[PDB]
């Protein structure tokens, strides 16, 4: 591939592992989710710019617009979780076991 791709590709892996291992806060994981889209944004832009894929120069912007809209929907749920149990801890969200 190339030398830069290794770190971008390894940055996605770090964020994925970070998202799959919650500690206590729900806000912490949403950041790991928005880190993933940042790595995908940079990785796609590197590919498109280097190959002179002109019409694909708009794709990274579309990736950013939808990923931010999804992030907004994520924060709204976090707020409604905090207004119920007083904190954004994931251990509280355990009613559905039974």
């Amino acid at each position: 591939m190339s030398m830069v791709y290794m770190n971008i590709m390894m940055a996605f892996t770090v964020s994925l592992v970070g998202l799959l291992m919650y500690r206590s806060h729900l806000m912490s994981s949403l950041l790991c989710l928005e880190g993933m889209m940042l790595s995908l944004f940079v990785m796609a832009a590197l590919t498109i710019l280097n190959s002179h894929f002109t019409l694909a120069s708009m794709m990274p912007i579309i990736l950013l617009v939808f990923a931010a809209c999804e992030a907004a929907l994520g924060l709204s749920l976090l707020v409604m979780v905090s207004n119920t149990y007083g904190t954004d801890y994931v251990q509280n969200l355990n009613l559905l076991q039974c």
Binding site: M1, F12, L16, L19, L20, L26, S29, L33, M36, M37, L40, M43, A44, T47, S51, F53, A56, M59, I62, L63, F66, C69, E70, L73, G74, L77, M80, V81, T84, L93, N94, L95, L96, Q97
Partner: protein, 347 residues
């Protein structure tokens, strides 16, 4: 919720799924999924209670993670082939993430732990959308990229789904959880025949949607969500118990009902490819599904459970629920075996 906003949100759930099915570009496929997840959360939060809030959160995190993996597969596929077309992927690593992203969205084992819990925390009408409509979009993509899916991966996810759906359903009394595990079990059949004959993936999907929609509709009519509450139906609407018996027997694959057709055709398309061990193991493990279906038939229609005194006040009012297409769905769920050769319309 305002009625007009309810229609608008529903049409956006449909539009998201339609965009996936009419798109020749991976970006529009991804946009289709995003528009679909954005619109379905409000119908899960509509009852405004902690359980709904928890269910919507567990669904968002699962579907958000799945969409990120899918977009990672698309970019890897762009690097190694320089195109966006919705077809076979050109990198084995892209195929694995793509296959795993779709598995998470579908709810296949071992990416299954959210289906019982999300379906339990939302109303019956929201569960009907979740278990029937939300399965169309991922299956459309699998129909198109199956030539490059890793055989050992797709067949391994199929086998686990059949097992975990079977064992999970035995230990349930809540109706919403029983359908959730029933949904996991039937997914394994659809993806087991996919490498061999994708036409039978659609047939099993169509039949599953018809049968599943019939069950949820009958539960919604009597507002029943637990096994016991369903056992009072014989004393309120006797006809509805005979329809539940017939559909439950159909879902179990017992001939001569409709639910035997997909299990019949999938076993045919696998023995043609010299696959004998897998269809037998799949068919035998499906008896677990027939068991906890039969248990509901014993407490609903074949025995008369205890009733309560206040039930007598219900006899004086009719059913004002919509029960849309219930007469048509129930007949299609039971009396379609003589029309099996009609599956060619799906080719």
């Amino acid at each position: 919720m305002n009625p007009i906003i309810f229609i608008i949100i529903l049409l956006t759930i449909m539009l998201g799924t339609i965009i996936v099915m009419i798109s020749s570009h991976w970006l529009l496929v991804w946009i289709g999924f995003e528009m679909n997840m954005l619109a379905i959360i409000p119908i899960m939060m509509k009852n405004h209670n902690p359980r709904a809030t928890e269910a919507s959160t567990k669904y968002f995190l699962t579907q958000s993670t799945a969409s990120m993996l899918l977009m990672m597969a698309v970019i890897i596929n762009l690097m190694f082939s320089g195109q966006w077309t919705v077809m076979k992927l050109f990198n084995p690593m892209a195929s694995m993430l793509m296959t795993m992203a779709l598995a998470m969205k579908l709810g296949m084992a071992p990416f299954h732990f959210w289906v019982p819990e999300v379906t339990q925390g939302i109303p019956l009408s929201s569960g009907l959308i979740l278990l029937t409509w939300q399965k169309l979009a991922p299956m459309s993509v699998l129909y198109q990229i199956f030539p490059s899916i890793n055989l050992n991966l797709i067949l391994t996810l199929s086998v686990l789904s059949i097992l975990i759906g079977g064992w999970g359903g035995l230990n349930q009394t809540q109706l919403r959880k029983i359908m959730a595990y029933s949904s996991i079990a039937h997914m394994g059949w659809m993806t087991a025949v996919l490498p061999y004959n994708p036409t039978m993936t659609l047939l099993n999907l169509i039949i599953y949607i018809i049968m599943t929609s019939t069950m949820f509709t009958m539960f919604m009519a009597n507002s029943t969500t637990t096994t016991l509450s369903l056992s009072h139906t014989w004393n309120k609407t006797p006809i509805m118990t005979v329809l539940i018996l017939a559909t439950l027997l159909s879902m179990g694959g017992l001939p001569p009902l409709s639910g035997f057709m997909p299990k019949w055709m999938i076993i045919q398309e696998m023995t043609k490819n010299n696959s004998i061990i897998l269809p037998t193991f799949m068919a035998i493990t499906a008896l677990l599904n027939l068991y906890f279906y039969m248990r509901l038939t014993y407490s609903t229609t074949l025995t008369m459970f205890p009733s309560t005194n206040n039930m007598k006040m219900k006899w004086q009012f009719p059913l004002m629920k919509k029960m849309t297409f219930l007469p048509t769905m129930v007949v299609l769920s039971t009396m379609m075996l003589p029309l099996t050769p009609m599956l060619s319309v799906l080719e």
